[PDB]
C-alpha cells in the first residue's frame, strides 16, 4: 500500500504520493500527520 497520512482536523486517511500537492482531499487542511504501522521495535523494561 501507499503510506497513509492523517489530517489534523477531519482525520481522513490520505495517501500522499511523492508528486502531488500536499493537502487533505476532503477539507484541505495543510498539516498532515503520519500513520503508524506494524513493525517490530524492541524496548527493554528497564
Amino acid at each position: 500500500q501507499p503510506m497513509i497520512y492523517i489530517c489534523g482536523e477531519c482525520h481522513t486517511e490520505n495517501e500522499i504520493k511523492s508528486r502531488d500537492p500536499i493537502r487533505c482531499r476532503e477539507c484541505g487542511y495543510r498539516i498532515m500527520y503520519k500513520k503508524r504501522t506494524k513493525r517490530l521495535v524492541v524496548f527493554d523494561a528497564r
Binding site: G8, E26, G28, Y29, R30, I31
Partner: protein, 63 residues
C-alpha cells in the same frame, strides 16, 4: 501633499482596518479561517491583512 509638474497630489488615509487571519484567496478549503495551532505546527506567522482607504486628490479636488 506633494508637488507634481505644477499640480499638487494630495493623499490621506481615511480609515484602516485589520482583518482576522484567513487563508489566501483562491485556496480550495472548507474552513477559511486560520487558527493558531496551524501556525505553530507549520512554523508560519499568525498574521492578519491590513488595508486602508487612501484618498488621492490633485489640486485640492477629491478625485
Amino acid at each position: 501633499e506633494f508637488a507634481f509638474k505644477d499640480e499638487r497630489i494630495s493623499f490621506t488615509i481615511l480609515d484602516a482596518v485589520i482583518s482576522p487571519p484567513t487563508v489566501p484567496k483562491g485556496t480550495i478549503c472548507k474552513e477559511a479561517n486560520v487558527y493558531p495551532a496551524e501556525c505553530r505546527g507549520r512554523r508560519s506567522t499568525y498574521r492578519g491583512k491590513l488595508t486602508a482607504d487612501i484618498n488621492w486628490a490633485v489640486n485640492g479636488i477629491s478625485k
